[PDB]
Amino acid sequence: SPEEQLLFLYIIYTVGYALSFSALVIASAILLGFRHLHCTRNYIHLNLFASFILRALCVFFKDAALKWLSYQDSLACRLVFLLCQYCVAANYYWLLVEGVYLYTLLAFNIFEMLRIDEGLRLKIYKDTEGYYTIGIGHLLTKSPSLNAAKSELDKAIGRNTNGVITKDEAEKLFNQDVDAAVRGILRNAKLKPVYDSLDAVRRAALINMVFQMGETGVAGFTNSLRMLQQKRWDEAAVNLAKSRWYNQTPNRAKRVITTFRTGTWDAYSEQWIFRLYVAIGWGVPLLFVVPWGIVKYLYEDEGCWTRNSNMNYWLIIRLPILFACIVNFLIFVRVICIVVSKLKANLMCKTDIAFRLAKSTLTLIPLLCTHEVIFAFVMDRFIKLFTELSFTSFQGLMVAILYCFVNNEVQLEFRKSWERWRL
């Protein structure tokens, strides 16, 4: 039947946005509700949920306006449609920062963590403790003799030093020290069981302490090491502050303790980077949605601008979303090259945040951007194509599932809260 087909597609579309709206409001309430879920990764998700929540609000407002000059001729409809088109562009640009974040998350490691904390030295320097240092935190000997320190470094580099050591030689010696740090942990009875239980992010935090202090030095933190192995991060965070290490070097310790408490790299992230993501997700859509809205009002104003078939005014809202999808597929392909490399080299386990986040992001990129790339320059079997209405309505539900309800961290918070109710 023709009327029955048009009515049935309306139901799966409206229940699609009803299930997506409720799931995204519940999902966003979970990420805001639990304090341990307050990290840059989940804040990026909250802006992405907000763009799908406002899109749903436009769909429910358009439908509510059907009940009582027709609505197609009104100015209110054109605004609801302009706001809807702003939400669609935000969905794809918050999906771009979602990919851009993931890619930088795969790029940050212990070597980049220590290069920030230890810094770089070109020439030999006698530090406050009496130890001669050079490169990226490479301590030589406490022996007060620059002549013998240069000779001690000469055997540890290959050729004659003179004093100045190049950027490549320092990185060569840096890989040695980081390899010497991990061999020490695994060669220690009190550090191997806690390191093997820690995730890749909290492992780098343990290596960082060993790099500065030493294998036998950090092994003394018997009180902190046990509550780390027992996954009690918040209890270990306040206990590590009550240390000699925290009062000696406080700016470095606060960063390492945050990485143990959260299991993220946020204490090494710059505050302007997140301000650049909000400028992409909510800023860039405004730069092409409002010129589209102005040209449609002045040169193609006919039935809430639904008659979008006359000039280049279609391309100004379809070329920027194609650009966000082409770059999202370039990230998609490159992220897969990095993830399969880190898994094969045993640099990553599938239980780590970078893999599980990749497992959801790499799903949503071809889920939202494949249609846009395939039918890239098509302006305008009718029942079979009307199945696009089912996926654009349930989009929000899928985002809420893959970035919240199947997330392992949120499931920890529900069980941790339920256990506190009993105890």
Ligand X SMILES: CC1(C)CC([C@@H](Nc2ccc(-n3cnc(C(F)(F)F)c3)nc2)c2ccc(C(=O)NCCC(=O)O)cc2)C1
Which residues are known binding-site members?
139, 211, 224, 239
Q: Are 200 and 157 in contact (CB under 8 A)?
A: no
If one asks whether residue 359 binds ligand X (CB under 6 A), the answer comes out as yes
The helix/strand/coil state of 163 is: coil
Q: Are strands 138-139 and 121-126 parallel, antiparallel or unpaired?
A: unpaired
Residues belonging to the binding site for substrate are 139, 211, 224, 239
- Tell the smallest beta-carbon distance from residue 125 to ligand OLC (Å): 37
If one asks whether residue 90 binds ligand OLC (CB under 6 A), the answer comes out as no
The helix/strand/coil state of 125 is: strand
Residues 127, 154, 196, 302: which is the catalytic one?
127
Q: Are 188 and 215 in contact (CB under 8 A)?
A: yes
Distances (CA, A) of 204 to 66, 102, 259, 332, 352: 58, 18, 9, 26, 13
- Tell the smallest beta-carbon distance from residue 50 to ligand OLC (Å): 4
Candidates 46, 96, 207, 325; binder of ligand OLC (CB under 6 A) is: 46
- Tell the smallest beta-carbon distance from residue 43 to ligand OLC (Å): 4
- Tell the smallest beta-carbon distance from residue 47 to ligand X (Å): 16
Cβ closest to ligand X, residue 27 vs residue 228: 27
Cα-based angle 214, 219, 222 (whole degrees, multiple of 5) = 150
- Alpha-carbon gap, residue 156 to 11, rounded angstroms: 73
State residue 181 phi and psi, 5-degree precision. Answer: -80, -45
DSSP H helical segments within 188-243, as ranges?
192-197, 200-212, 215-218, 222-229, 233-241
122: which DSSP letter?
A: E
If one asks whether residue 357 binds ligand X (CB under 6 A), the answer comes out as yes
- Residue whose pair of structure tokens reads 């027709």 in the numeric block: 70
If one asks whether residue 81 binds ligand OLC (CB under 6 A), the answer comes out as no
Residues 117, 118, 215, 352: which is the catalytic one?
118
Cβ closest to ligand X, residue 98 vs residue 215: 98
- Tell the smallest beta-carbon distance from residue 354 to ligand X (Å): 10
If one asks whether residue 50 binds ligand OLC (CB under 6 A), the answer comes out as yes
Query: Active-site residue 127, yes or no?
Result: yes
Instruction: Indicate the residue type of 257.
Output: I
The helix/strand/coil state of 378 is: coil
67: which DSSP letter?
A: -
- Tell me the chain's radius of gyration from C-alpha atoms: 28
Cα-based angle 326, 327, 333 (whole degrees, multiple of 5) = 95
Q: Are 266 and 246 in contact (CB under 8 A)?
A: no
Contact characters 282-321, ligand X, x per CB under 6 A: ----------------------------------------
User: Which of 322, 332, 358 is CA-nearest to residue 343?
Assistant: 358
With CB cut-offs between 5 and 8 Å by kind, which of ligand X, ligand OLC, none does residue 362 bind? Answer: ligand X
With CB cut-offs between 5 and 8 Å by kind, which of ligand OLC, ligand X, none does residue 357 bind? Answer: ligand X
Contacts of 117 (CB under 8 A, 6+ apart): 137, 208, 212, 252, 255
Interface of this chain with ligand X, residues 386 to 405, rule: CB under 6 A: 402-403
- Alpha-carbon gap, residue 358 to 335, rounded angstroms: 8
Q: Which stretch binds ligand OLC (CB under 6 A): 39-47, 66-74, 118-126, 407-415?
A: 39-47
- Tell the smallest beta-carbon distance from residue 366 to ligand OLC (Å): 14
- Alpha-carbon gap, residue 362 to 349, rounded angstroms: 17
If one asks whether residue 57 binds ligand OLC (CB under 6 A), the answer comes out as no
If one asks whether residue 43 binds ligand OLC (CB under 6 A), the answer comes out as yes
Cβ closest to ligand OLC, residue 38 vs residue 183: 38
If one asks whether residue 91 binds ligand OLC (CB under 6 A), the answer comes out as no
If one asks whether residue 395 binds ligand OLC (CB under 6 A), the answer comes out as no
Q: Which stretch binds ligand X (CB under 6 A): 22-30, 101-109, 244-252, 350-358?
A: 350-358
Q: Which residues are catalytic?
A: 118, 127
Positions touching ligand OLC (CB under 6 A) are: 25, 28-29, 32-33, 43, 46-47, 50, 53
Positions touching ligand X (CB under 6 A) are: 336, 339-340, 343, 356-360, 362-363, 402-403, 406-407
